[PDB]
Structures are given as structure tokens and as C-alpha cells.
Amino acid sequence: GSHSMRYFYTAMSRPGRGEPRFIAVGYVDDTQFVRFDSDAASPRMAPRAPWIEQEGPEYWDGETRNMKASAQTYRENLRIALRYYNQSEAGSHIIQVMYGCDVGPDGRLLRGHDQSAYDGKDYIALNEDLSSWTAADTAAQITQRKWEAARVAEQLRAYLEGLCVEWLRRYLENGKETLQRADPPKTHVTHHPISDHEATLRCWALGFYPAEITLTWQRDGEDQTQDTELVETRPAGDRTFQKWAAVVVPSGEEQRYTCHVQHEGLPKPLTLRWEP
């Protein structure tokens, strides 16, 4: 019932190989819907979901204008960060930004976000009040001082409670067929002998959307957290996701083990066992 919109920007410097590359992607929940890349032959905000294609020229031109402006800002921020951290002009560095809004079933703002990182470490973040900042270090405290002077948080707050929520609501309605459809996991248990003494039981979940899922093994009804091998949830490439959880069990003790699956697409959590 709850939904989110998030934009992710990455600016990467590459001394001696031109100006820094700027790439932006937009998502609603786990569905990418737009992309911008400064390295494209003709850089433009481009559609990546069928439900955004209906947006007119005014949308695409406006989004492209904002992206080219953001690429210019972040190339300047990469030069500013070199100064704040006393770094040479010889190395490659990265700025990352993630921002957006979360809404509940009624479409009202649950929370806003605006966070930045330099070289993969937190730099500055807008606090949950949408009025104050958390700076990670003394360099980010310089940016915090500049942004408090320019009342940047008020501008972000207006966007997050305004245009962000309004456009997320629009995308959810335009893409309701897919954005508002949960696909439950297709589940099964496989058994692979290791030796005469042990076997692997692997619990699979396939074809599910959204990505959030819980896959756990229990032995005699007790969670096997330390003994379970869990792979990271992975995209199948057709919008859906996959995951598996495995446990090594003694031969003949297979029926003591149960796999539990929780997913928003499931009315009730599922219990699975190996079926020989």
C-alpha cells in the first residue's frame, strides 16, 4: 500500500579523460522509470518505463534542462570537495545523491529524504524534520553553514511536500497496472547431497515484485540465522526478483526443517518443506 519515489545521481571525475560523468536514474518503488547520462551521444532525460512515455514534450524538455544544470552543479561540487579535503587534482572522486519521498496508502507524505556522499562516505543529509542538516565531518559543516545561510532546507521541504508527492501520486495512477500490482513469489525446495552425512536444502523464491521479501529456515521451529546462507535479492531482468536461502542438514533429518516465506503479494506467510 505504501510507495516511494527516489532519484539517484552519481558524478564521477576522471582527470585526463574529460569532464566528470553525470548519471541520474529515477525509481518508483523498485521500478526504474527515467535515466540521464552526460556520456550519451545526445544527453536527455529518457523514459525507462512504459507508463512515463505518455508525458509530453514540456515534461522531457524541462527534465533535460534540470539534469544538464545538475551536471554542471555537481562538476563544480567535485572541484569544491577537492579543496575541502586538501586533495590533488590527479585522482578520481565520486559524489552521490539520493532524494525523494515516501507516501502511505492515502498518498500523504510519510517522510522525505535528501542525502549526499563523497567517495562512498556520508557527507551531508537533510534531517527527518526537513528543516535541519546532519554533517558528517568538518568539510560538510562548511556546506551546512552555506546551506543554512541560503535557507536550502526550506526549498527542499517545499519540493518534498509539494511536487514530489504530487508527481508520485500521478505516476502511481498512470502506472497502476504494474506499480500497484504485487507478484507473489513462486516457491520450491531443492535437495542436493554433499556427502554421505549431509545435504543442502535450498529454499527458492522466484518471480516476485516488489523486491522486499523474508526467507528463513527453522529447525524444530527455531530460526537458523547463523547457519543459513542467504543470497542478496537479485533482479531477473523482467521486473521481478529472485532470492534463495540454504541450510546444510544431517542425512535423514530433512523433515525437521521448514522454510518460511513472507511477501506483500502473499495473503499469509508460507511454510515449505522438502518434498521427496
Binding site: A24, N66, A69, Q72, E76, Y99, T143, K146, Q155, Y159
Partner: peptide, 8 residues
């Protein structure tokens, strides 16, 4: 829609 510039 993206945020409609604030240097570090």
C-alpha cells in the same frame, strides 16, 4: 519529477 542549484 526532479527538484526544479546549491553548491557545496
Amino acid at each position: 519529477r526532479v527538484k526544479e542549484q546549491h553548491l557545496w
